[PDB]
Amino acid sequence: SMLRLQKRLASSVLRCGKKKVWLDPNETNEIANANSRQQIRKLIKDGLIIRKPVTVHSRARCR
Amino acid sequence: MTHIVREVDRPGSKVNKKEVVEAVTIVETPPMVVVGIVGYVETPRGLRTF
Amino acid sequence: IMNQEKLAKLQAQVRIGGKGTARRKKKVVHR
Amino acid sequence: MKVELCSFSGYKIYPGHGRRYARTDGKVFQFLNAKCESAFLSKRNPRQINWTVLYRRKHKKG
Amino acid sequence: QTKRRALEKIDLKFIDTTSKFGHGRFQTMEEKKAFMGPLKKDRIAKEEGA
Amino acid sequence: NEVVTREYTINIHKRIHGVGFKKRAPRALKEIRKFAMKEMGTPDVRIDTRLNKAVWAKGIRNVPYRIRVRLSRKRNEDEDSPNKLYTLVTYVPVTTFKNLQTVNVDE
RNA sequence: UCUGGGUCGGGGUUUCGUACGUAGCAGAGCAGCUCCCUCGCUGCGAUCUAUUGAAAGUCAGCCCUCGACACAAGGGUUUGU
RNA sequence: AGAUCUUGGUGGUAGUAGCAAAUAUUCAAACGAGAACUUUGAAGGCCGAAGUGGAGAAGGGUUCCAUGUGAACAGCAGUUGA
Ligand SMILES: [Mg+2]
Ligand SMILES: [Mg+2]
Ligand SMILES: [Mg+2]
Ligand SMILES: [Mg+2]
Ligand SMILES: [Mg+2]
Ligand SMILES: [Mg+2]
Ligand SMILES: [Mg+2]
Ligand SMILES: [Mg+2]
Ligand SMILES: [Mg+2]
Ligand SMILES: [Mg+2]
Ligand SMILES: [Mg+2]
Ligand SMILES: [Mg+2]
Ligand SMILES: [Mg+2]
Q1: Which of A20, C2, D17, D44 is deepest in the core (most CB within 10 A)?
Q2: How far is B28 from chain D (nearest CA, A)?
Q3: What is the Cα–Cα distance from D1 to D3, expressed in whole angstroms?
């Protein structure tokens, strides 16, 4: 269905922007059950929600 | 189209007995094949296919 | 154990994006 | 059939092709195209242009 | 056809046949081969097939 | 046979020539889907995302001149669909496009 | 059809101008290695040289293939003195 | 029958003008009767810290957050929504 709430909660729980929020496309239904931040914590612990790394902005060219 | 170089034989002109360039057109003309004949009759209204 | 068939299908799960993207680390379901 | 010319590039210019240039000092040049002409007007040495005949014979290419 | 422009003998001397797909600068294939010499394309072609 | 897959190359540069800058990348895949329909004769076409990356590899307007794809017409007995067959196209990375011919490839 | 049209490929033509890589006792030079050497070796170094008139593109509204590939006697609507 | 009459309704115009200020979208899957517009994932872009960011004052007053619906509204769609 729609994961608008889950993405917002995952961004709030991980204290990162919605840009870096990543979800497992295959396990859509299990994540759709997450109606609380406590359940979000389980999904992160279960790895279904993953914080994407910071996009690379290297300063080697400047150096 | 293309261009050529030829000798000019126009007396009294500045290009007489000289060399000039002239653009020419190449038109392919394979031989025709005749398949029919139509004759026309001269009516007071003009021409019509007899 | 990680045999040829398991390593064949592991490449699908661990890859979540193209070149330059981070690799998937875990996938566990537990009740 | 006419006089057959040579250019900045050293190439052979056929009749009806290119242009002819006459400077103030009296020297007369002919160019196969604009590219050979533009290089000449930019004051560039044809011995440093790889497709110029003068460069090829300078380095004995071929 | 009365005027001297008409009824005037025409003799050809040279015809442009260069590549009109751009600034053509060779009338024939052979002169292009002669002027430019053997290229990399013909060098390998005569070397692979032997 | 009705399940055979094949390898093709597409002159994207030829089929994009004349299209504006901000539409070159979308037109490439529209041509690709049309190209897939023309050969495999199946209106239902699926485009692999890796190939979609390959079209978008050099941005939106400098679309690669040629691409090498692998058409796969597969039996679509998955649900109630008017087409029994669907064409899945995949991107085949190549080092060069010289002397490449359309080859019949096994499954 | 004595096949046809396509899609690639090849070739021709053309545009720009000599590709990456490799090598060079070429390189303003600079830094480490000298029982070493009797003038040397190992790194950095824009550029230059042979490869290399090379590399790339070339009909989508350029040309010729007989090389490869499948496809094409299929679909629908009408038309009578 | 009028009074550029008053009120209410209905035409041609006409399926016409038009839906063009601020660069840009694409592929796959999911839900669904139905997806160019929803959700996720994968790209390519944009705002480029005097922002399309992060919080307020005035003002708005429940628009806030869930769950559900697809009657009307979001000048198209909407499985979405202030
Ligand atoms: Mg022309
Ligand atoms: Mg070609
Ligand atoms: Mg009245
Ligand atoms: Mg009256
Ligand atoms: Mg009135
Ligand atoms: Mg109008
Ligand atoms: Mg209109
Ligand atoms: Mg508009
Ligand atoms: Mg920017
Ligand atoms: Mg702000
Ligand atoms: Mg309704
Ligand atoms: Mg509407
Ligand atoms: Mg709300």
Answers
A1: D17
A2: 24
A3: 7
* CB of A51 closer than 8 Å to CB of A16: yes
Q: Please give the C-alpha separations between residue F7 and each of A39, E15, F32, F72, in angstroms, as whole numbers.
A: 47, 48, 13, 9
Nucleotide G6 C1' to residue F16 CA (A): 18
Q: Tell whether A3 is within 8 A of chain C (Cβ).
A: no
Q: With contact defined as beta carbons under 8 Å apart, do B6 and B20 qualify?
A: yes
Q: How far is the CA of F21 from the centre of ligand 8 (A)?
A: 21
Pairing relation of β-strands D28-31 and F5-11? unpaired
- CA F55, chain centre distance (Å): 10
Which residues in E lie closer than 8 A to residue B3 (C-beta atoms)?
Answer: 16
Cα distance from N-terminal residue to C-terminal residue, chain E: 63
Tally D–E CB contacts below 8 A: 21
Residues β-bridged to residue B3: B23
Query: What is the stated resolution of the deposited model, in angstroms?
Result: 3.6
| Cβ density class F2-29: b for 16+ within 10 Å, e for less | eeebebbebebeebbeebeeeebbebbb
Contact F101, F6 (CB under 8 A): no
Q: In what order do the strands lie in the sheet with F85-91?
A: F45-47, F85-91, F66-75, F5-11, F103-105
Nearest CA in chain E to D56: E36
DSSP chain D: --PPEE-TT-PEEPTTSSEEEE-TTS-EEEESSHHHHHHHHTT--GGG-TTSHHHHHHTT--
Sign, CA dihedral A13-C25-A20-C15, equals: negative
Distance from the Cα of residue D42 to its chain's centroid: 13
Q: Which nucleotide is closest to F4, CA to C1'?
A: G70
Tell me how far CA of residue B28 lies from CA of A41, B2, B23, E17, in angstroms: 82, 14, 17, 16
Q: Token pair 């007071």 is at which residue?
A: B44
- D contacts of B5 (beta carbons < 8 Å): 1-2, 15-16
Residue B48 Cα, gap to closest chain D Cα (Å): 51
The experimental technique used to determine this model is cryo-EM
